[PDB]
């Protein structure tokens, strides 16, 4: 469902991994993120340009008809600017302003219900807050919003990822950070921790839960499978667990949130395609858990 969600990022280029039109993407998955948007030569601005050679020569009509698809079962398709090689900066009012402008025009040509910021090249919360609301002056409240950052970007309330999405709370859909491809970070509780276990989940999720962001704002990412990520991958009873220990206190690992969460939205992967090259048991295991919350 959409309240208690799992995100999965569809790849628009093929890295080895299975391809996939939008129709192939398991039912499992609430939100569809279009991994990505390009970079243009006018700063803040981005542009959409369907793989069709790289995809099997998909085309761009089918495309859009397989989001109709989606949409009429239930689900939502957003568009995801920035990746690990993305060029995007907003970090002046043209390039917000050209940013919003520029989503918008990519919604509405392919009627994405909305966008997910994954920005890795870093994230100004002065220019980006601006850029989020002239985009949802445009597309409204039921504008679908999320963003992925990386570990780095959520380990205080001062992060330009964490002071975005608090100046955007109203507006925000869901945090999907990304537990993966990290170093060792502190918890909630000032300790290390480290990835690929059920602590770097809890522990790192629970600075966000105690730390101005909604429980329905809070989602886990992980890699789908080893050949997803160059670490972090976790088992599926992993991420299982630590949806347990947020949502209802029980399989924690050492580490104890002082609440419990039932509201926490859920768990994103990258990504469809890597889930389908190991026979979807990802999306199998957590999806089920999840609707299951």
Same mark, same amino acid.
């Given at each position: 469902?959409?309240?208690?969600?799992?995100?999965?990022?569809?790849?628009?280029?093929?890295?080895?991994?299975?391809?996939?039109?939008?129709?192939?993407?398991?039912?499992?998955?609430?939100?569809?993120?279009?991994?990505?948007?390009?970079?243009?030569?006018?700063?803040?601005?981005?542009?959409?340009?369907? @793989?069709?050679?790289?995809?099997?020569?998909? %085309? /761009? &009509?089918?495309?859009? #008809?397989?989001?109709?698809?989606?949409?009429?079962? *239930?689900?939502?398709?957003?568009?995801?600017?920035?990746?690990?090689?993305?060029?995007?900066?907003?970090?002046?009012?043209?390039?917000?302003?050209?940013?919003?402008?520029?989503?918008?025009?990519?919604?509405?040509?392919?009627?994405?219900?909305?966008?997910?910021?994954?920005?890795?090249?870093?994230?100004?919360?002065?220019?980006?807050?601006?850029?989020?609301?002239?985009?949802?002056?445009?597309?409204?409240?039921?504008?679908?919003?999320?963003?992925?950052?990386?570990?780095?970007?959520?380990?205080?309330?001062?992060?330009?990822?964490?002071?975005?999405?608090?100046?955007?709370?109203?507006?925000?859909?869901?945090?999907?950070?990304?537990?993966?491809?990290?170093?060792?970070?502190?918890?909630? @509780?000032?300790?290390?921790?480290?990835?690929? %276990? /059920? &602590?770097?989940?809890? #522990?790192?999720?629970?600075?966000?839960?105690?730390? *101005?962001?909604?429980?329905?704002?809070?989602?886990?990412?992980?890699?789908?499978?080893?050949?997803?990520?160059?670490?972090?991958?976790?088992?599926?009873?992993?991420?299982?667990?630590?949806?347990?220990?947020?949502?209802?206190?029980?399989?924690?690992?050492?580490?104890?949130?002082?609440?419990?969460?039932?509201?926490?939205?859920?768990?994103?992967?990258?990504?469809?395609?890597?889930?389908?090259?190991?026979?979807?048991?990802?999306?199998?295991?957590?999806?089920?858990?999840?609707?299951?919350?």
């Amino acid at each position: 469902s959409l309240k208690h969600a799992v995100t999965g990022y569809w790849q628009n280029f093929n890295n080895g991994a299975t391809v996939q039109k939008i129709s192939d993407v398991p039912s499992a998955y609430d939100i569809i993120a279009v991994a990505f948007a390009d970079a243009t030569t006018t700063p803040g601005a981005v542009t959409f340009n369907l @793989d069709s050679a790289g995809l099997g020569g998909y %085309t /761009v &009509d089918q495309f859009k #008809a397989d989001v109709r698809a989606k949409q009429a079962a *239930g689900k939502k398709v957003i568009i995801s600017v920035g990746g690990e090689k993305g060029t995007v900066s907003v970090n002046s009012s043209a390039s917000a302003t050209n940013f919003a402008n520029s989503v918008y025009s990519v919604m509405r040509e392919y009627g994405f219900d909305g966008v997910d910021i994954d920005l890795e090249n870093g994230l100004n919360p002065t220019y980006m807050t601006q850029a989020l609301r002239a985009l949802s002056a445009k597309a409204g409240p039921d504008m679908i919003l999320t963003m992925a950052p990386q570990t780095i970007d959520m380990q205080s309330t001062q992060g330009g990822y964490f002071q975005t999405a608090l100046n955007v709370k109203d507006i925000l859909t869901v945090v999907n950070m990304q537990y993966y491809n990290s170093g060792t970070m502190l918890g909630c @509780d000032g300790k290390v921790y480290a990835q690929g %276990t /059920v &602590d770097f989940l809890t #522990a790192l999720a629970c600075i966000q839960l105690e730390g *101005g962001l909604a429980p329905s704002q809070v989602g886990l990412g992980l890699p789908a499978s080893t050949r997803a990520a160059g670490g972090g991958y976790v088992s599926p009873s992993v991420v299982n667990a630590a949806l347990d220990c947020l949502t209802k206190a029980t399989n924690c690992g050492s580490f104890k949130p002082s609440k419990t969460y039932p509201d926490l939205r859920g768990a994103m992967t990258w990504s469809t395609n890597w889930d389908a090259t190991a026979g979807n048991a990802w999306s199998n295991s957590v999806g089920a858990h999840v609707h299951a919350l």
